[PDB]
């Protein structure tokens, strides 16, 4: 049997908000170490990596590794029926091909209690290496979300230039072209408004805003987001999850 009692219900809803738009079905790897999930999109261009430490939860108990296959659209629909203040408890047996979700209310008037069908999934786990990145940018998630969303109205694609000084997001449309330039934060600020750039080499890559805008769906998870880039290797967009772990998005460049 497996069971995890998450006090901050919202944390969970906000995650499926991020995923369902990018990936329909995906395999949840459950461990004594916590919940780990990895999956490419429909089209094998973007990849999503999810990590929630067992420390994260109030209860957490998993005996054997589980491999739960889940229609995330199915599951989002369920989590939409959970209040933001709700305590969300999860439960599955081994031979169980259903996952139970239980939503307790703020001061417990009410208890919702769903149960979701699973699926079997083939999952060629992709070796993602740990790697230093030519440029890593830490910036407001809100600003990043806002940038990718605006430029989508200019063009298909964003060019990200990065140096010591700052980072430039650009696109070309039929209508014109736009350059949004942010500088490393002076008065090195209260950090959820602040921009910082660790920079080994300047870097300029080109990505489909189409996908980035599926990533920014995670911005309700963290004030900041960290962009990690090296030439001819995927972008990493990392949304920190409130001490429990992280959600990393990976995207191939162009030609």
């Amino acid at each position: 049997m497996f069971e995890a009692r998450l006090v901050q219900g919202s944390i969970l809803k906000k995650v499926l908000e991020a995923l369902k738009d990018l990936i329909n079905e995906a395999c949840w790897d459950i461990s004594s170490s916590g919940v780990n999930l990895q999956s490419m999109d429909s089209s094998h261009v973007s990849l999503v990596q999810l990590t929630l430490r067992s420390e994260g939860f109030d209860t957490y108990r998993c005996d054997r590794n589980l491999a739960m296959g889940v229609n995330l659209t199915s599951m989002s629909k369920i989590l939409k029926c959970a209040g933001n203040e709700d305590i969300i408890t999860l439960r599955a047996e081994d031979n169980a091909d259903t996952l139970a979700l239980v939503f307790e209310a703020p001061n417990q008037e009410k208890v919702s209690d769903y149960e979701m069908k699973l699926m079997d999934l083939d999952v060629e786990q992709l070796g993602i290496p740990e790697q230093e990145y030519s440029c890593v940018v830490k910036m407001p998630s809100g600003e990043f979300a806002r940038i990718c969303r605006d430029l989508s109205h200019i063009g298909d694609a964003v060019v990200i230039s990065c140096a010591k000084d700052g980072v430039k997001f650009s696109a070309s449309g039929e209508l014109g072209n736009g350059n949004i330039k942010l500088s490393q934060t002076s008065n090195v600020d209260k950090e959820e408004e602040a921009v910082t750039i660790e920079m080994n080499e300047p870097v300029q890559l080109t990505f489909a805003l189409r996908y980035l805008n599926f990533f920014t769906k995670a911005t309700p998870l963290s004030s900041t987001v960290t962009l990690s880039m090296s030439a001819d290797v995927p972008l990493v967009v990392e949304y920190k999850i409130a001490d429990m772990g992280h959600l990393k998005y990976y995207l191939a460049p162009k030609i």
Partner: peptide, 11 residues
């Protein structure tokens, strides 16, 4: 153009 992250990982 744009390729697959299949190409950039694998295993």
């Amino acid at each position: 153009s744009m390729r697959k992250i299949c190409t950039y990982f694998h295993r």
